[PDB]
């Protein structure tokens, strides 16, 4: 009797394995990926984006904006001492 | 104006800067500064899931977060050696306590 037709019916091996699910994710995801990002934000020259550029970089954990920002509040109230005295 | 009003504005401006230039426009990798405000998020997440844990635990999570951050910033600002202590105007902190 003639061989049956199972080997040639493939359309439930298109969901049949788990990486089909992953495939339909990364055919979208990686295809819509850019070569490099859009932009990281670091500066924009609003003149305080420069503050971010010098101090608040991705790799700058350096305490300098803190010191500067602290010193700003010291400059503020010290003048206000002379506003009240 | 009022001294109290002026320093409340200063606190507001401090709090804004930690989420608008600390970050690198929300870089997934995470910036050195933005790691700080991640850790704060996690320790109040894991604290207020632990305290007021239950079906609702996150419904009062913003309130407990802005009660953290207000006091956390107001105990640095109030410690600058020439600054007007909002917190050492005890009546505001105590009023807030009685309100809650």
Question: d(Cα B81, Cα B50) in Å, to the nearest integer?
Answer: 37
Q: Please write down the HEC assignment for all residues of B14-77.
A: HHHHCCCCCCCCCCCCCCCCCCHHHHHHHHHHHHHHHHCCCCCCCCCHHHHHHHHHHHHHCCCH
CB of B84 within 8 Å of a chain A CB? The answer is: yes
In the three-class reduction of DSSP (H, G, I as helix; E, B as strand; rest coil), residue A32 is classed as coil
Resolution reached, in Å? 3.8
Q: How was this structure determined?
A: cryo-EM
Q: What's the longest Cα–Cα distance across chain A?
A: 111
Considering only CB atoms, which chain B residues are within 8 Å of A83?
Answer: none
Best B1, B83, B85, B86 residue to mutate vs chain A (most A CBs within 10 Å)? B83
B31/A58 touch (CB, cutoff 8 Å), yes or no = yes
- Read off the DSSP letter of residue A6: G
Q: Which residues, at least 6 apart from A23, have a Cβ–Cβ distance to it below 8 Å?
A: none
Angstrom distance (rounded) from CA B7 to CA A73: 10
Q: Which residue has the tokens 């055919």?
A: A27
Cβ–Cβ below 8 Å for B33 and A76: no
């Amino acid at each position: 009797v003639s061989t049956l037709i199972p080997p040639k019916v493939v359309s439930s091996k298109n969901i049949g394995s788990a990486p089909n699910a992953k495939r339909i994710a990364n055919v979208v995801h990686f295809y819509k990926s850019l070569p490099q990002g859009p932009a990281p934000a670091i500066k924009a020259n609003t003149r305080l984006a420069r503050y971010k550029a010098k101090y608040f970089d991705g790799d700058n954990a350096s305490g300098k904006p803190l010191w500067h920002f602290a010193l700003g509040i010291i400059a503020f109230g010290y003048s206000m001492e002379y506003y009240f005295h | 104006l009022t001294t109290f009003s002026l320093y409340t504005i200063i606190v507001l401006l401090v709090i804004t800067s930690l989420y608008t230039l600390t970050n690198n426009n929300n870089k997934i990798i995470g910036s050195r500064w933005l790691i700080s405000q991640e850790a704060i998020y996690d320790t109040i997440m894991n604290m207020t899931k632990g305290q007021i844990g239950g079906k609702n635990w996150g419904l009062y999570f913003p309130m407990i977060f802005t009660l953290f951050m207000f006091i956390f910033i107001a105990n640095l600002i109030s410690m600058i050696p020439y600054s007007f202590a909002l917190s050492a105007h005890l009546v505001f902190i105590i009023s807030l306590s009685i309100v809650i």
